[model samples]
Target: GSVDSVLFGSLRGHVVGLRYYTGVVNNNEMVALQRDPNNPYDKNAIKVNNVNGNQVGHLKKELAGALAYIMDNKLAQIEGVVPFGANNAFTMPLHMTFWGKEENRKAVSDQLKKHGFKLGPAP
Candidate 1:
């Protein structure tokens, strides 16, 4: 007999070879990330997992795959993932936003372009 399971939508497949419910630990709260290279689909795909010393739900992605550094261990130590603007935790069409730089230099650059917010010429 087949066992009934709670529906988790797209996040379902990301849990292969693992045990436990999807997005359970992460909930709609703060989440973390790790690369899911084994994914048969887009190899560039990243896994957004919530962590409390243990894996949790989803977090985020990037347009140019900047977060890939976290996977490759080249990027600086990630302090945390902070969500800004108006976005519900469970919302769709993710921001797909990410940025990294020496101090806040690159930060002020990309965010402006991402949403068409230009920086001051005096900067």
Candidate 2:
């Protein structure tokens, strides 16, 4: 059963696993955040993929854990999934909206704060 969820907030965070992409990823492209619970390293891993399903990066550990929990159990919504840069940068910036139930707002907000996630007006 999925609970009703809405635009809880927006988040901007650094992404890892981009060293291999180079020019393959570009700015302002729609992307998807997929939960990877079975990941060998981080159980709460969330894979970030572009429109073509090519992986751009994974959400940082803490944020991944916090977001994954809500997504795994709710019909949460994620919008405006975009990467900030490529150009062989060591890391990239990912922007997305977090849409979830009000009950999870504090949890998500706390995680956002811990990871230095930029909140407030969407960019």
Candidate 3:
């Protein structure tokens, strides 16, 4: 019967795990994981979430505000994720290849430095 309960058993084992790669890199950028004409991964992509440019701008602005709040209040600590300090916070890698350009990277590095962030390594 559907109401009848059946006992199930499973075995668990302890195994060692290793993190092969873990480090922060500044100015590291990769192609955005989205539809790309020349990329095989993007060839068969289907758009899921779509937002207009203006909407995106608004959302980005709002996000910036929120981040500012966290930084200002010293409540920006993130675990198992990115680290944020009182005066500055590390930004997650922007997965956009254009950001990898030397000029763009330098521009961003300068901007971040102005805000008290120290550039680490460029990916």
Candidate 4:
């Protein structure tokens, strides 16, 4: 439960509501992240976008900052969102061939550690 519980997003962000706004965002569609270094609040903020580069929304809170960190330091497109429902999705890094793989798992854990955050073990 902890692993699933740890995920986050800004559903109200302009881009995140693209699905509800346009009915175009559906399950399995690829979402991209663009770093907004100039964001007034968090320098490491990330803008989640559609494949066409249209802004969909923000990542929200810790997940937002954590993803921004990896996007800045590690792989260019480190993660991919695999949406399963209107507001539900299972995401892993673009590098991993399967869900919960070592690289993807470890990377999130490592990034979380940077901010004193950690996903408790699954129940």
The global C-alpha lDDT for each of the candidates, from Candidate 1 onward, is 0.37, 0.69, 0.23, 0.50
What does candidate 4's lDDT look like per residue over 9-121, in tens digits? 11211233233222234556767667889989788777666677766555655666666766676422333443455353322222111123344556756666787655543
lDDT at 102, model 2: 77
Q: Per-residue lDDT tens digits of candidate 2, residues 4-123? A: 766666777667877755335667777778888888999889887777787777877877866776578754566644555655467677777767677877776766566556456633
Model 2 lDDT at residue 67: 70
TM-score for each predicted model, relative to the true structure: 0.38, 0.72, 0.22, 0.54
lDDT of 1 by residue, 1-123 (tens): 113321111111122212332443322344455666775754655565545545432333332144443436433223233233113234322222223334544554444356443333210
Clashing pairs in 4: 15-56, 15-57, 16-56
Which sections of candidate 1 miss by over 4 Å?
A: 1-21, 24-29, 52-64, 79-123
List residue ranges in candidate 2 displaced over 4 A. 1-5, 20-23, 101-123
Off by over 4 Å in 3: 1-99
Q: Report the number of the highest-TM-score candidate.
A: 2
> What are the clash counts of all predictions, listed in order?
3, 0, 0, 3
lDDT of 3 by residue, 2-39 (tens): 13321111111110111221222223111112222343
* Model with the higher lDDT, candidate 1 or 3: 1
Residue 101 C-alpha lDDT in model 4: 35
Query: By descending TM-score, how would the candidates be arranged?
Result: 2, 4, 1, 3
Candidate 3: C-alpha lDDT: 0.23
Residue pair clashes in candidate 1: 48-58, 50-56, 50-57
